RNA sequence: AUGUGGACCCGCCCCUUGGGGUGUGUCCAAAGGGCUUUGCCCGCUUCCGGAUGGGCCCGCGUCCCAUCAGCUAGUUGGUGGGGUAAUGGCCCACCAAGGCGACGACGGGUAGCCGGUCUGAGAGGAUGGCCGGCCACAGGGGCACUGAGACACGGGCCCCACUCCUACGGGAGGCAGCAGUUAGGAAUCUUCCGCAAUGGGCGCAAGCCUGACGGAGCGACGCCGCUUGGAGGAAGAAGCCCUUCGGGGUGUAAACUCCUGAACCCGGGACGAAACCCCCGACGAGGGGACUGACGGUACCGGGGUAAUAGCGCCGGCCAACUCCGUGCCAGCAGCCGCGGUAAUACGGAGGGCGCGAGCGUUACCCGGAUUCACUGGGCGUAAAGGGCGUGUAGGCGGCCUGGGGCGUCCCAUGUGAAAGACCACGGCUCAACCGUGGGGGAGCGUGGGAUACGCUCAGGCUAGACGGUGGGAGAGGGUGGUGGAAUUCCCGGAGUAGCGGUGAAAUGCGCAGAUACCGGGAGGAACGCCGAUGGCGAAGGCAGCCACCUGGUCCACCCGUGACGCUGAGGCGCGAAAGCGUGGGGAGCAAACCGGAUUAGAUACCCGGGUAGUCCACGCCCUAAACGAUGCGCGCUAGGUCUCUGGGUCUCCUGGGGGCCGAAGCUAACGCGUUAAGCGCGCCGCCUGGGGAGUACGGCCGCAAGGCUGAAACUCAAAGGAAUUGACGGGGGCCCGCACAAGCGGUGGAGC
RNA sequence: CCUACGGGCAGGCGCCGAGGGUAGGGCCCGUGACUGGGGCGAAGUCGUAACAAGGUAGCUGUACCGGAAGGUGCGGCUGGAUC
RNA sequence: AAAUGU
RNA sequence: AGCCGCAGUGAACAGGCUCUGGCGACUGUUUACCAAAAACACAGCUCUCUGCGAACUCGUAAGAGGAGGUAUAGGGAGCGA
RNA sequence: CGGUCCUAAGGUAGCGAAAUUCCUUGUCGGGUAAGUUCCGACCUGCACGAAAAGCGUAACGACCGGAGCGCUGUCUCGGCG
């Protein structure tokens, strides 16, 4: 059923990360795609590969992390410390080019659908647009 | 809740009940003394506090507290009501201002004379 | 009468909702006064423009109660009329039967709306007082007249209420204008000056009117500025406080010595005022010339010149500031927590200290803190909170691909967003408060132009969601009709005695009228032992001997068909244990109420003997609950181990769907939850907002009734609470000791001292 | 009455019409002998219901009863100790 | 069988 | 659209209305000839009798009513929707 | 709440100065300028109380009681035909 697939993607990752895995498979879309992409372009992920599973298409998403720390709980820092849906079907979030995030002071990145597509806070500002804020990541 | 719900109802706006309804958004309210007597406070302590029952303007008759040491209030004595409960004595929610109308200040009081309607005494000669 | 020109009917013309042009026909204009008079000026009448001010209309926005859920006869539309500057059901006829409402009509309560204002990090919340914009009213109502304009505060008619005058012969008035009076109230001023200036009316203009306005007056009501002094001045008097009697404190404070000098006295003295007018030029352009200041002899300037009011709150914690004395749960304090019971930093005074200062406190109210209505920005297992469980209407939300549309959304440009205020920068009153100048920007809304990712939408396409086919599975799922055995009870027969029952022990009770116990027979009702489980089925309530019929849900395998048909669900509807209700049956066992026997201080209880409704059947109501997993539904994601029920499999094992335990990560206040989440997430619904009052009262709906649902407030408390910790206790448990009982020997209790 | 007389004004009639009157409803506030509970308040009276198996495990919906807490019946819940 | 304690 | 009168159901035949108690549910019955009522009756509830040649009633009896009925029937009693 | 005596058992619910209350015109409230009646309350029920039924009940009544409107020769108070 899935009321929101985009959230399901993000959430699938967030679930996968907190157990530190190699890959994370997720149902395919041309809009889920150009949403991921950035996550490789901004290097939040290794990247992905369009594959198929049981005759059905998915997107194996490969997870980056960090250094095997030491002390008790040697589990490394995440790359993705935080990620959450913003605009939702329950409440769609649109913003002018002005009204636009400064996620974790530049260190974070918003992701938005606009009249030119899946821009970022930085980009959309410079192209001068703004649109449907999908999510925030750091 | 959810957001849909929020459009359907919104959030309710608390409201605030007064605790000095005998006054009606007034700082004070003049009245007339009906009874003047002493009462016993909450077990917590014990004494004989001076309170007046006051019939005011608005037909109202409420118990008002008489503060300090002694006064000059028989029955038919014009008064002025302040605002502020006693806590010890239940039911009383109002004070009487001193030195106004038929109720006078506290005799030979040297300290907090702002209350107690006591004028400044002469110190030299 | 004139007609540039205008209006009206019909025409064509363009344009287009009664706009413009024209054709004919017919109707429309008037004014004179003064002169540096023979020329100009102030006016007159028609038309088109302009500009200003409006009228009407439209979209969007604008409070609380659904305990107000249905409203409507000019109501809604039409036709034709009446009316207006003009639209319109604005009014009137006639015709039609429409118009409005969970997107909250209708009704009720409160309110003038905005620019602003206060607070707030913000988002918000609060508010509309002075100033500005608009609406509305002018004692309460109605009405029209005149007019460019009003249905008119200081114009008019009428009715009412009220007050006043009068030879009473009858008539008069409308402060919410400026002051002022009264009354009400906790509370709000002068019955001042002047048109000098600004503005407004009239006039050619002098000039006139202006309680608009410019000033003055009263009030620490607010903001701001300023004074009651400055330098010196002791190892630091006196007095007053403490004191371990040594001393410490007030305290450079005073005194005292120098210096300045608020006030007050003298002199001078404004700006605010330049035009209207006047001269020349044409009274125009122009230079030029002239009158006028209420505030006021005021501010300010000079000189002279005097050390010249300080108060209020607090000093237990929060919260800055400590000591004697008095008091002795008294007198008293208190914003909360709380102080006072003969040693009080918490009362009262005192000394001292902290904090502001012509102010300091208090009360009332708004915002903050309160993330405590949570959009930003919260919760519902046990703290307040998941609807008892389904089905489903509206509604919200919606999977994968490609187009068109570009609604939302995004960008640009443009208009609008008034001034004032606020913010930034600089100036002006000796600073500031005030005040000026200039700049700074939207938000929204219209308009133009773009972009298609997303949502939307129209179209097309698939299959992973969902639905379906075929083959099957398990099951106390439900309804109807039958049927079996054990047992209790009662009746009959036989046999057989002297007691049976019952309890902690007894009694009431039954029994020589033949009881209990035993055999045989008969009638009747209810519930189904072992199987049976920590199991299965159902959405929940709930379902259990056995047979048949009717029948719901659900799981597995095969991967065939439909093509997003989905998820949730306010209302609606249906089901809903027990008790209880109605009408009829039925009634063995049991058993509220009732009676009795015991216990006990009493025992309207507990235990015992009796016992009626009810329990069971049919039909119809009632609709509650610890209706519980105290955990709403659907989908996706995130370790495993073990036990089990039930499918399928190349039957180890694998896989599917259930029922439990321990548990990764993670969550949690902890207890605990954990692929049967309380983890990570999305959709939708229900619900919470301190405790008591209270699931009460009023209203409404439902019910035969008992009652159910919806569901407050005044008032009152300063906590009510959740989980966990250490203790203590238990007529809780396990283990163990003590002359602690028991076992045993002497006494005390009686008598006399 | 005026002529500007096929006119106009007075004047008469009519519809509407402030409000007054009569009648019957609706909502709201105040008030009322008496009555119902509720809250608070002094070391008053009666008992022991609950918290330890609370000395009958407790709570619970409904029903009947009892001076009072409560008791009992039916079904339910464990938020019930205990070799 | 076994109550209470400003 | 009008006309006349003080007046048009122009004469005659036609309810006065409301609020609020007691009693009886209600239509009905009764003391012919002083009481119409809150008395009787009434549908309805309960008790009790009665297995049929019923009980009960009338009659010495025969007989008959009950009833050409048969416990959802019939008789008696009290209460009275 | 307790004690004690007695009883077969000691009047529950609900009503109550009542078609029932002697004292009595009980006391209080309403109504009226004034109310032994009436209506509503209290309970000290001389002497209510559950099928000789208890407490209510919409509708009905030539029953009995209290109040008001309307209207009257009933009346002030009579007069005429
Ligand atoms: Mg005390
Ligand atoms: Mg005390
Ligand atoms: Mg004080
Ligand atoms: Mg002419
Ligand atoms: Mg034209
Ligand atoms: Mg003219
Ligand atoms: Mg002349
Ligand atoms: Mg105008
Ligand atoms: Mg009409
Ligand atoms: Mg028309
Ligand atoms: Mg028209
Ligand atoms: Mg007009
Ligand atoms: Mg609403
Ligand atoms: Mg209104
Ligand atoms: Mg108003
Ligand atoms: Mg505002
Ligand atoms: Mg601000
Ligand atoms: Mg600010
Ligand atoms: Mg705001
Ligand atoms: Mg506002
Ligand atoms: Mg105000
Ligand atoms: Mg004002
Ligand atoms: Mg204004
Ligand atoms: Mg007035
Ligand atoms: Mg006027
Ligand atoms: Mg007027
Ligand atoms: Mg007006
Ligand atoms: Mg006036
Ligand atoms: Mg005035
Ligand atoms: Mg006064
Ligand atoms: Mg005044
Ligand atoms: Mg003034
Ligand atoms: Mg002037
Ligand atoms: Mg002027
Ligand atoms: Mg002029
Ligand atoms: Mg002149
Ligand atoms: Mg004048
Ligand atoms: Mg004047
Ligand atoms: Mg002025
Ligand atoms: Mg001043
Ligand atoms: Mg003052
Ligand atoms: Mg010293
Ligand atoms: Mg000294
Ligand atoms: Mg000095
Ligand atoms: Mg000098
Ligand atoms: Mg001078
Ligand atoms: Mg002048
Ligand atoms: Mg000039
Ligand atoms: Mg000049
Ligand atoms: Mg001078
Ligand atoms: Mg001088
Ligand atoms: Mg001096
Ligand atoms: Mg000096
Ligand atoms: Mg202070
Ligand atoms: Mg402070
Ligand atoms: Mg301190
Ligand atoms: Mg001492
Ligand atoms: Mg002493
Ligand atoms: Mg002392
Ligand atoms: Mg002490
Ligand atoms: Mg203090
Ligand atoms: Mg003190
Ligand atoms: Mg001092
Ligand atoms: Mg001091
Ligand atoms: Mg929120
Ligand atoms: Mg919370
Ligand atoms: Mg939830
Ligand atoms: Mg609880
Ligand atoms: Mg709870
Ligand atoms: Mg539930
Ligand atoms: Mg439900
Ligand atoms: Mg329900
Ligand atoms: Mg739907
Ligand atoms: Mg949709
Ligand atoms: Mg879609
Ligand atoms: Mg703009
Ligand atoms: Mg396109
Ligand atoms: Mg599209
Ligand atoms: Mg399609
Ligand atoms: Mg099949
Ligand atoms: Mg099947
Ligand atoms: Mg089966
Ligand atoms: Mg079956
Ligand atoms: Mg069956
Ligand atoms: Mg025998
Ligand atoms: Mg025998
Ligand atoms: Mg015997
Ligand atoms: Mg015997
Ligand atoms: Mg014998
Ligand atoms: Mg036998
Ligand atoms: Mg199950
Ligand atoms: Mg169950
Ligand atoms: Mg089946
Ligand atoms: Mg297929
Ligand atoms: Mg196909
Ligand atoms: Mg559903
Ligand atoms: Mg509704
Ligand atoms: Mg039904
Ligand atoms: Mg039921
Ligand atoms: Mg039952
Ligand atoms: Mg009953
Ligand atoms: Mg029954
Ligand atoms: Mg029966
Ligand atoms: Mg028995
Ligand atoms: Mg007994
Ligand atoms: Mg006994
Ligand atoms: Mg005794
Ligand atoms: Mg028994
Ligand atoms: Mg619940
Ligand atoms: Mg659940
Ligand atoms: Mg639900
Ligand atoms: Mg199975
Ligand atoms: Mg198998
Ligand atoms: Mg499982
Ligand atoms: Mg576990
Ligand atoms: Mg672990
Ligand atoms: Mg598992
Ligand atoms: Mg509360
Ligand atoms: Mg409350
Ligand atoms: Mg409450
Ligand atoms: Mg209730
Ligand atoms: Mg209830
Ligand atoms: Mg209510
Ligand atoms: Mg009610
Ligand atoms: Mg409920
Ligand atoms: Mg606890
Ligand atoms: Mg222990
Ligand atoms: Mg123990
Ligand atoms: Mg032990
Ligand atoms: Mg011994
Ligand atoms: Mg011995
Ligand atoms: Mg001895
Ligand atoms: Mg002795
Ligand atoms: Mg002895
Ligand atoms: Mg009228
Ligand atoms: Mg009228
Ligand atoms: Mg009325
Ligand atoms: Mg009362
Ligand atoms: Mg007490
Ligand atoms: Mg108990
Ligand atoms: Mg106990
Ligand atoms: Mg006991
Ligand atoms: Mg117990
Ligand atoms: Mg317990
Ligand atoms: Mg019970
Ligand atoms: Mg009783
Ligand atoms: Mg008793
Ligand atoms: Mg209880
Ligand atoms: Mg039970
Ligand atoms: Mg259950
Ligand atoms: Mg006692
Ligand atoms: Mg007529
Ligand atoms: Mg007639
Ligand atoms: Mg006649
Ligand atoms: Mg008639
Ligand atoms: Mg009666
Ligand atoms: Mg009758
Ligand atoms: Mg009756
Ligand atoms: Mg009759
Ligand atoms: Mg007779
Ligand atoms: Mg006779
Ligand atoms: Mg007669
Ligand atoms: Mg009769
Ligand atoms: Mg015969
Ligand atoms: Mg015979
Ligand atoms: Mg015979
Ligand atoms: Mg015969
Ligand atoms: Mg026969
Ligand atoms: Mg019979
Ligand atoms: Mg009778
Ligand atoms: Mg006996
Ligand atoms: Mg009696
Ligand atoms: Mg009794
Ligand atoms: Mg009684
Ligand atoms: Mg009564
Ligand atoms: Mg009486
Ligand atoms: Mg009697
Ligand atoms: Mg009386
Ligand atoms: Mg009276
Ligand atoms: Mg009276
Ligand atoms: Mg009489
Ligand atoms: Mg009476
Ligand atoms: Mg009787
Ligand atoms: Mg009797
Ligand atoms: Mg009897
Ligand atoms: Mg009777
Ligand atoms: Mg009666
Ligand atoms: Mg009658
Ligand atoms: Mg006569
Ligand atoms: Mg005669």
Secondary structure class of A115 (helix, strand, coil): coil
CA distance A112 to A114: 6
Phi/psi for A16 (5° steps) reads -60, -50
CA distance B104 to B101: 7
Protein-covered nucleotides of chain D (CB closer than 7 Å) are 40-43
Nucleic acid strand D within 7 Å of B87 CB: no
Q: Residues of CATH 3.30.1370.30 domain(s) within chain A? A: 3-80
Resolution of the structure in the document, Å:
3.1
Secondary structure class of A11 (helix, strand, coil): helix
Burial class (CB in 10 A: 0-12, 13-18, 19+), A84: exposed
CA angle B9, B14, B19 (to 5 degrees): 155
CA distance A32 to A63: 16
User: In this structure, which topology does domain A81-138 adopt according to CATH?
Assistant: Dna Ligase; domain 1 (3.30.1490)
What b-and-e string marks burial along B38-65, b requiring 16 or more CB atoms within 10 Å of the CB? Answer: ebebeeeeeeebbbbbbebeeeeebbbb
Sequence-separated (6 or more) residues with CB below 8 Å from residue B83: B20, B23, B27, B28, B93, B94, B95
Helix boundaries (H) for chain B: 3-8
Nucleic acid strand D within 7 Å of B107 CB: no
Nucleotide nearest residue B110, measured CA to C1': C349
Domain A3-80 has CATH 3.30.1370.30: yes
Q: Residues of CATH 3.30.1490.10 domain(s) within chain A? A: 81-138
Closest CA to B52 of B28, B31, B22: B31
Length in residues, chain A: 138
Distance in angstroms: CA A15, C1' C29: 95
Secondary structure class of A33 (helix, strand, coil): helix
Contact residues on chain B for A90, CB-CB shorter than 8 A: 2-4
- The 3-class SS string of B91-112 reads CCCEEECCCCCCCCCCCCCCCC
Nucleic acid strand C within 7 Å of B28 CB: yes
Distance from CA of A92 to the nearest CA of B (A): 11
Q: Which ligand is nearest to the CA of B88?
A: 1
Tell me the technique behind this structure: X-ray
Nucleotide nearest residue A130, measured CA to C1': C410
**C-alpha B4 – ligand 98 centre gap (Å):** 33
Closest CA to A62 of A26, A35, A28, A30: A26
* Residue of A3, A91, A92 for testing the chain B interface, max B β-carbons within 10 Å: A91
- Find out whether A125 and A97 touch, Cβ atoms under 8 Å: yes
CA angle B1, B2, B3 (to 5 degrees): 130
- Find out whether A91 and A116 touch, Cβ atoms under 8 Å: no
Phi/psi for A25 (5° steps) reads -90, 145
CA distance B98 to B118: 8
- Find out whether A36 and A59 touch, Cβ atoms under 8 Å: yes
Secondary structure class of A123 (helix, strand, coil): helix
């Amino acid at each position: 059923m899935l009321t929101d697939p985009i959230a399901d993607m993000l959430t699938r990752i967030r679930n996968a990360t907190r157990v530190y895995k190699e890959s994370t498979d997720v149902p395919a879309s041309r809009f889920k795609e150009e949403i991921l992409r950035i996550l490789a372009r901004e290097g939040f992920i290794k990247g992905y590969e369009r594959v198929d599973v049981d005759g059905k298409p998915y997107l194996r998403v490969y997870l980056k992390y960090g250094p095997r720390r030491q002390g008790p709980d040697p589990r490394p820092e995440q790359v993705i410390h935080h990620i959450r849906r913003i605009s939702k079907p329950g409440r769609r979030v649109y913003v002018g080019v002005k009204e636009i995030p400064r996620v974790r002071r530049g260190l974070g990145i918003a992701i938005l659908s606009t009249s030119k597509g899946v821009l970022t806070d930085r980009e959309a500002r410079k192209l001068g647009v703004g649109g449907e804020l999908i999510c925030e990541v750091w | 809740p959810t957001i849909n719900q929020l459009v359907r109802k919104g959030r309710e706006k608390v409201r605030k009940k007064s605790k000095v309804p005998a006054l009606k958004g007034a700082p004070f309210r003049r009245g007339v003394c009906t009874v003047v007597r002493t009462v016993t406070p909450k077990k917590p302590n014990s004494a004989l506090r001076k309170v007046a029952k006051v019939r005011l303007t608005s037909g109202y008759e409420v118990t008002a507290y008489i503060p300090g040491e002694g006064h000059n209030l028989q029955e038919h004595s014009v008064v002025l009501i302040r605002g502020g409960r006693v806590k010890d004595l239940p039911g009383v929610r109002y004070h009487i201002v001193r030195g106004v109308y038929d109720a006078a200040g506290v005799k030979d009081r040297k300290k907090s004379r702002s209350k107690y309607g006591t004028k400044k005494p002469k110190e030299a000669a």
